[PDB]
Amino acid sequence: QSVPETQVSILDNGLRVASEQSSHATCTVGVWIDAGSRYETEKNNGAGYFLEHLAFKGTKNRPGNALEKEVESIGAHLNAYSTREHTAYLIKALSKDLPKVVELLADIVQNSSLEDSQIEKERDVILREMQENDASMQNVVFDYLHATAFQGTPLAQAVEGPSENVRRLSRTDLTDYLNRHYKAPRMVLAAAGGVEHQQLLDLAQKHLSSVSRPCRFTGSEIRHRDDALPLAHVAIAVEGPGWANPDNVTLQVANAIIGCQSFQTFNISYSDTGLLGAHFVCDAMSIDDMVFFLQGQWMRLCTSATESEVTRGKNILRNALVSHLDGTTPVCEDIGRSLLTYGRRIPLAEWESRIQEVDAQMLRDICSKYFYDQCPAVAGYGPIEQLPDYNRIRSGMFW
Amino acid sequence: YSLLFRRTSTFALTIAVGALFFERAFDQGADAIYEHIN
């Protein structure tokens, strides 16, 4: 595969600058930060989201629309996102523009300016959208599959936070989150595409060299009944192994075996925890039959796998998790997480080796370890009266 | 749990075996108690 290895050179502050040169002419230079809603302490539950809104509204060097203007003029796309564990600010731009794609990113992580005036507006923006964020039923289901599964922990609370905090937030608080969770050893400068690693390392030395230097799963159930909705969304999960756990790969193959309606499957991983399960949307009348169907399948893998199907699963995984030339953005993203989670970029050859070592016996062993006789977390929203209660799903978790 | 409470099959075996012995044991103890009372 002649994979372009990801050369990662570290910095004094610890930016762990990394890179994976590629022929593509445009590149994606991003900053990842190990800071999410898991690091918030319920008094600043929307600080990362609201800082993610404020981060493009001007820094000392780029007051007002300067930031957006320049990153617009250069012709680059500026994006940012926040999860429960990671925050990313990345720019897709013509490689030659690295010089500015990097200096701009430096401002966004440090020297940022949180104009109180702007703060006011972003508050309104976040709040109002949240007032409508309820339209994204799936996100709702998935932010309760989190609340009821991680009750009492910082992993239950959402990325956006409760409207309460959103309204009650001030520059100083933000400043704290910014000055507390934006440390240089918890930061990765990732570059993918037409970039040279030595030039990127010199730019990180020139700019960004200033950056300062028991989660538990609770088998439970939340049922939001609202019978006026046309469709019902139900998510059932168990405790995922984690990000670093080796068995994650044998679980991905299991998901590739499974693949009523919109019956997706997810393996969300956080630092030594996670949610492994399925989300499906169905007319109310069929919710119970779906559930029965789904539980039977998990059970099928646990006791009755087949090399053929495993193969089907290994192959789909193989065509997946490539993140290679899939594009600068995706690749950079993967590197961004790989340096934050694993501490290194796992190459695709190692992924292929870990895929080909998976057989049917260890797949049903790992599935029995993680699915069989486990207490799930259930989150339902919509006409969910025929959704079975916890004893029936409890009993369907075993044969 | 890892021997008789993991999968229904295992659970079944212990039940059968345990019941097999409990029967005699119960009667035996009853003998003492019954004789004790009388």
């Binding site: 309820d134 709702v140 932010d143 009750q151 009492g152 936070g161 439970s220 207490c375 | -």
Partner: peptide
């Protein structure tokens, strides 16, 4: 929306090893 109120605390009920339980 869907985040303002959190899971009510079941601590009292919670039996503050799973295999054992």
């Amino acid at each position: 929306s869907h985040t303002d109120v959190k899971v009510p605390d079941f601590s009292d009920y919670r039996r503050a090893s799973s295999e054992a339980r």
